[PDB]
Amino acid sequence: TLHALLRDIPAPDAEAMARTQQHIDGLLKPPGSLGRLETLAVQLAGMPGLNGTPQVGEKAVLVMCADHGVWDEGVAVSPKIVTAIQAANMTRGTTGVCVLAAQAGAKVHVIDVGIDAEPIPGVVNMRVARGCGNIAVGPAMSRLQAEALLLEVSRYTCDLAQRGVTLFGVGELGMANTTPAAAMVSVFTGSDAKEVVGIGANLPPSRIDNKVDVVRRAIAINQPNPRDGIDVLSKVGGFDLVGMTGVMLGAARCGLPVLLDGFLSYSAALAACQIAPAVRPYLIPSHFSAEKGARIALAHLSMEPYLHMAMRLGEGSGAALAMPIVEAACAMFHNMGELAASNIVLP
Amino acid sequence: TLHALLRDIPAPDAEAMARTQQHIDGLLKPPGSLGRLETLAVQLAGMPGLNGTPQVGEKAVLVMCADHGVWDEGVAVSPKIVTAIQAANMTRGTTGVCVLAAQAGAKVHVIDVGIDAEPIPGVVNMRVARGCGNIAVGPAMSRLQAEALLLEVSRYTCDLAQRGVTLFGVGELGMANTTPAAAMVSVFTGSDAKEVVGIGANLPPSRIDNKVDVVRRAIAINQPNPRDGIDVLSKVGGFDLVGMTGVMLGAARCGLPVLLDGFLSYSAALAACQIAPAVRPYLIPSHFSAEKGARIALAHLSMEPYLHMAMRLGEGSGAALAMPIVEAACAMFHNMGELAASNIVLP
Lengths: 347, 347
Ligand SMILES: O=P(O)(O)OC[C@H]1O[C@H](n2cnc3ncncc32)[C@H](O)[C@@H]1O
Ligand SMILES: O=P(O)(O)OC[C@H]1O[C@H](n2cnc3ncncc32)[C@H](O)[C@@H]1O
Ligand SMILES: O=C(O)c1cccnc1
Ligand SMILES: O=C(O)c1cccnc1
Prior knowledge:
alpha/beta, binds 7-alpha-D-ribofuranosyl-purine-5'-phosphate, 2 domains, glycosyltransferase (chains A, B), Rossmann fold, homodimer, nucleotide binding (chains A, B), binds nicotinic acid, 5,6-Dimethylbenzimidazole Phosphoribosyltransferase, Chain: A, domain 1
């Protein structure tokens, strides 16, 4: 059951974290001089799946692909078919996340949770339906469908842990998905749609007004409950967004770290933390999306991204780009010399 | 002569940059969606030493080490000997920059431009003197000494280019060096000392007032000319700071990119750009130093760091941490597929 899953998410190991902090303080450098790299190492040390120490074994980026019915409301400029096309390209390694993941030594897992097209060979099949319902006139899916996908994705995720994966990255693919993402952010943060609706994948500025209106309509018609993350996801979210939330719950249950990506991932993280606050300690920010509603989303998650690249591609491209940073924290921890060894004393 | 050197710094190749932009726009993604990663690739494409395309061959981090006479004014908490000790540790690979450089596949070059101690085996010897003069009572060095080191370091730098190095990172080591760095920033930016003097390597807050006073005294007594970068460096700078400036001039003359590090590097970059504006196009920011005067320095250099890690170690540790980002831009450029190949059309 999902209740068991949520109930079994482990709390951070404070004992391992204390030993980490002490060790970092004794390294060949002025105490605290490596700033957020030190904080990151301690965070990792508290994750039970890492065996009491900051370490990175195998790396995987999970890309959840699906189509959205709200695409018919004219909120996206790319043809709907671009989702299926790009999902296929993911298997050929020519996409942005594939190239960056290869650069970071990570494997890309492409999962189809609801693409509106024939099944794509090479893509993991977990499709709920051929595209989710149009949120502007009703819910994206039933609560049952949402919970089922959460469970399936979380199981898939923690199963990879048995294959040596210790670091996850989340990603997505789905034309028009920045619309339900904005709706969710508006609902969870209590912000007006206008403040969190962006241009997504180059939406013309003249078409923004319509996008804001669609978001408002979706909310008014569905009346999602902000205190129920599953309610929000099933009503104004999408299969892809649900899948991303599932990776976060899965990794957390597995006691492992997850790298967030951009705007879509922020909306999924808001939902995950609402569903289970215990997931928070396992989330690691990557970059600061150029999407309008990024600042608001990040503020509610109390997260400060490490990378400011004005990126807005999605796919988990930002998550892959940050993996080297996580490895750097581990390298610092394990490979630096110690002050005592050089007889140096620094207050 | 130094005049020849400065005169021969090549301008960016606009033709190669135009071809770069066109290619990036045709990649398998919404135009401009990779933000600053795209801008970085184009910048690299314009650097003549890279052969008309964003590419990274061998990587090197140059660490300029030297002691400062102003240390006697009580502006630093670490014993003066820590410079020599850490410089030795650089040869053993136990320091922060060594670990991060190894993680990025870069080689660390440790250069002694003025450590106040016996020569250290394994360290490149270019020492001007055993520590520079105390800037609080007079100049750090003579103009002649400054120009000579600039020339020597710039030659060493461009010579590495012949060994396959295509990407440089700058670093330093020198107890009390954030004092002359603050003086230089104050002079070049016209900001008051109080606004740019930080805690350096954990200087107690109760000792900050004295540091501000020392900086003011150095400026009042030396009267450095803001319009003459060499004048400023020789008067209120240090051998290490001069050396960093030399790496920047050298790489620029070689038509190659240089990654800045933190606060000390910002002061050296201000000087380099004053000496020769043509150097600017070759400078690449890495992280946003936690030092107080960082914001002001970066504003005058019109640079926005990619990494926000609250780092303040120095040594070129931030520069090494950003190398993977430069390689990512190259990977994007060369390895992504093209829109035309998938028959996809995106405005
Ligand atoms: O709401 P919007 O405006 O449609 O933007 C969301 C989509 O843009 C991104 N995206 C990611 N890869 C893409 N390849 C082509 N087009 C878009 C792409 C993201 O992954 C989604 O597919
Ligand atoms: O002006 P301040 O307060 O002395 O700070 C500047 C120094 O701190 C950094 N630094 C870099 N490595 C160090 N190892 C030990 N101590 C300091 C260190 C930097 O490289 C300089 O050596
Ligand atoms: O921040 C993102 O991940 C993003 C922003 C716009 C369009 N697609 C993805
Ligand atoms: O920004 C830096 O590089 C820095 C700041 C403080 C002390 N040492 C180095």
